[PDB]
């Protein structure tokens, strides 16, 4: 019992690690992307452009 | 066994909250990519000038 409740535990735990993978990642993916790229690109068309 | 897997599962709610540090540690990333990249214009103005 004292095993397979704490599996269970264990299972949950994972999944909830597992789903928060997907927003974590994503969550560094996002940082820069929507952020520095086209910012800089027009402070390159601003300094250049 | 199973008290070790009681210890098995408690280091599983840190590791899916080790998930959660992802989330605060690395998508809490993006001001360093905001603020170091929305941050020539002001300055580009004494270049239009």
Redesign the interface.
């Given at each position: 019992?004292?095993?397979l409740y704490?599996?269970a535990?264990?299972t949950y735990?994972?999944d909830?690690?597992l789903e928060?993978?997907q927003?974590?990642?994503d969550?560094?993916n996002?940082?820069?992307d929507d952020?520095?790229v086209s910012?800089?690109q027009?402070?390159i068309e601003?300094?250049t452009g």
């Open positions: 019992t004292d095993d704490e599996v535990e264990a735990e994972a909830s690690s928060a993978f927003t974590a990642l969550g560094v996002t940082a820069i952020v520095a910012t800089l027009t402070e601003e300094l």
